[PDB]
Scaffold this active site. Structure first.
Site, PDB file in Angstrom:
ATOM      1  N   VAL A 129      49.625  61.471  28.291  1.00  0.00           N
ATOM      2  CA  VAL A 129      50.129  60.227  28.180  1.00  0.00           C
ATOM      3  C   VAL A 129      51.549  60.736  27.709  1.00  0.00           C
ATOM      4  O   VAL A 129      51.091  60.652  26.949  1.00  0.00           O
ATOM      5  CB  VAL A 129      49.388  58.461  27.988  1.00  0.00           C
ATOM      6  CG1 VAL A 129      49.233  58.631  27.164  1.00  0.00           C
ATOM      7  CG2 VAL A 129      50.680  57.796  28.376  1.00  0.00           C
ATOM      8  N   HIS A 157      48.501  64.430  23.836  1.00  0.00           N
ATOM      9  CA  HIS A 157      48.735  63.459  23.512  1.00  0.00           C
ATOM     10  C   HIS A 157      48.351  62.563  24.893  1.00  0.00           C
ATOM     11  O   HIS A 157      48.969  62.629  25.812  1.00  0.00           O
ATOM     12  CB  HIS A 157      49.767  63.215  23.080  1.00  0.00           C
ATOM     13  CG  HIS A 157      50.871  61.433  23.046  1.00  0.00           C
ATOM     14  ND1 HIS A 157      50.601  60.433  23.922  1.00  0.00           N
ATOM     15  CD2 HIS A 157      50.382  60.949  21.759  1.00  0.00           C
ATOM     16  CE1 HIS A 157      50.711  59.427  23.346  1.00  0.00           C
ATOM     17  NE2 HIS A 157      50.749  59.416  21.936  1.00  0.00           N
TER      18      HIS A 157
HETATM   19  O1  LIG Z   1      52.494  56.164  23.701  1.00  0.00           O
HETATM   20  C1  LIG Z   1      52.205  55.488  24.023  1.00  0.00           C
HETATM   21  O2  LIG Z   1      50.839  54.963  23.118  1.00  0.00           O
HETATM   22  C2  LIG Z   1      52.273  55.194  25.383  1.00  0.00           C
HETATM   23  C3  LIG Z   1      53.103  55.579  26.307  1.00  0.00           C
HETATM   24  C4  LIG Z   1      53.145  54.582  26.588  1.00  0.00           C
HETATM   25  C5  LIG Z   1      52.074  53.134  26.777  1.00  0.00           C
HETATM   26  C6  LIG Z   1      51.960  52.383  26.909  1.00  0.00           C
HETATM   27  O3  LIG Z   1      50.763  52.259  28.027  1.00  0.00           O
HETATM   28  C7  LIG Z   1      50.552  51.302  28.289  1.00  0.00           C
HETATM   29  C8  LIG Z   1      49.785  52.015  29.093  1.00  0.00           C
HETATM   30  C9  LIG Z   1      49.427  50.255  30.520  1.00  0.00           C
HETATM   31  C10 LIG Z   1      49.972  49.125  30.115  1.00  0.00           C
HETATM   32  F1  LIG Z   1      49.249  48.657  30.946  1.00  0.00           F
HETATM   33  C11 LIG Z   1      50.442  48.810  29.238  1.00  0.00           C
HETATM   34 CL1  LIG Z   1      51.065  47.511  29.113  1.00  0.00          CL
HETATM   35  C12 LIG Z   1      50.942  49.840  28.367  1.00  0.00           C
HETATM   36  O4  LIG Z   1      52.241  53.495  25.625  1.00  0.00           O
END
Ligand SMILES: O=C(O)c1ccc(COc2ccc(F)c(Cl)c2)o1
Ligand SMILES: O=C(O)c1ccc(COc2ccc(F)c(Cl)c2)o1
Lengths: 163, 163
Positions: free
Chosen positions: B75, B69
Site C-alpha cells: 500500500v 510497505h
Molecule cells: O500508510 C498508510 O498507513 C496508509 C495509506 C493509506 C492508508 C489508509 O488506509 C485505509 C485503507 C482502507 C480504509 F478503508 C481506510 Cl479508512 C484507510 O493508510
C-alpha cells in the site's frame, strides 16, 4: 504486554510478519522503516495513563533520504518523522494482541518547527496513547526530538487495524 | 506565472535546482519525489480564488514503496501522498518567484479514508491555495484521489521558504 523494549532485529522480524504473525500489524521494512529501536513501551502511564512508546532512529550522513531530499540541501523529510509516529501507534495496537493489518487514518494538528540534518546523531519519538476503541483504533499525541531538541508535534494521530 | 503545466523532466530539473535556481524551492529527487506531472497550476481561481494545482503520479506494481510497505500487504504510504501535497505547495511558492528553500510547517486535520494499491493506475492531487503571507508561507487544502476516488483530505497544509 511482557516485552517492553525491542532491538532493530525485533523490528525487522516485525516487518516480515514474524513478530505479531500473519495478517497482524507489520512495521515497514527498509527503506520505509523510520525506527531503529523501541526503548520503552507500556499500556499504563504516559500523559493520559493509557501507555507510552519511546523509540529512536540513529542518524548518519549516508541515510538514503538525505541525497534526494533535497539535492544540496539535505533534511530528513518531515513526512517520514510523522510516519514513524503512525508506525509506532500501529506497533502498539499489535503489541496489545489485537488482530488485523495497520493503516494510518490521519491526525489533528501537525507542526514542524525544526529539522534533522545529516550532522544529527539521534532522533527520539515520544508517543502518548490517549484512547483505544474496540473497528479497533488508537488515538495518540506524539513528539519528534533530535539530540534533545523537540522539533515536531502531532495531536490526534489515528491508526486502525483491518480484519 | 507564464508556464501552467510541467512534465516529469521539468520536475527533475526542479529537483536539481535548475528550474527556480540555486537557494530557491526544490522538489525532492527520486525516490522522495511523489509527482510525475503538474497538469495545472494558476495563482487565480480554485476554491478560494488564490490559485490551484492539479498533479498526477502514475502507479505501477514496481514502485519501490510497495515492496517494503508492507511485505505481503503493499500500500502506498499515506505519509508520501501527504508529502506530495507539501511538495506541491512548496512548488507554488517557488513558481510565484519567491526566494528561499522550502520546508513543510505542518497541517490541520489529515484524513486517510482509502488506499493506493499496486493495481491502481493514477493518483491525482488537487491543492487549493487559501492564503500566502509575506516570513513567506502558504496555507492550502488538498485532496488525494486514486482512479477518480477521493481517499485523503488535508486542511491547513503549511509550507514556508527560508532565506
Ligand atoms: O500508510 C498508510 O498507513 C496508509 C495509506 C493509506 C492508508 C489508509 O488506509 C485505509 C485503507 C482502507 C480504509 F478503508 C481506510 Cl479508512 C484507510 O493508510
Ligand atoms: O520535509 C520537510 O519539509 C521538513 C522537515 C522538517 C521541516 C521543517 O523545517 C523547518 C526548519 C527550520 C525551521 F525553523 C522550521 Cl520552523 C521548520 O520540514
Amino acid at each position: 504486554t511482557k516485552q517492553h523494549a525491542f532491538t532493530r532485529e525485533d523490528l525487522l522480524r516485525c516487518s516480515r510478519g514474524e513478530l505479531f504473525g500473519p495478517g497482524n500489524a507489520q512495521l515497514p521494512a527498509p527503506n520505509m522503516l523510520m525506527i531503529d529501536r523501541i526503548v520503552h513501551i507500556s499500556d499504563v502511564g504516559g500523559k493520559y495513563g493509557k501507555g507510552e512508546l519511546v523509540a529512536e532512529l540513529d542518524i548518519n550522513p549516508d541515510l538514503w533520504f538525505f541525497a534526494c531530499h533535497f539535492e544540496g540541501d539535505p533534511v530528513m523529510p518531515g513526512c517520514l518523522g510523522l510516519d514513524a509516529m503512525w508506525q509506532l501507534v500501529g506497533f502498539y495496537l499489535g503489541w496489545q494482541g489485537n488482530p488485523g493489518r495497520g493503516r494510518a487514518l490521519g491526525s489533528g494538528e501537525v507542526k514542524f518547527f525544526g529539522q534533522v540534518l545529516p550532522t544529527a546523531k539521534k532522533v527520539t519519538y515520544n508517543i502518548h496513547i490517549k484512547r483505544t476503541i474496540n473497528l479497533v483504533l488508537a488515538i495518540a499525541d506524539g513528539t519528534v526530538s533530535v539530540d534533545g531538541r523537540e522539533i515536531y508535534s502531532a495531536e490526534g494521530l489515528r491508526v486502525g487495524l483491518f480484519t
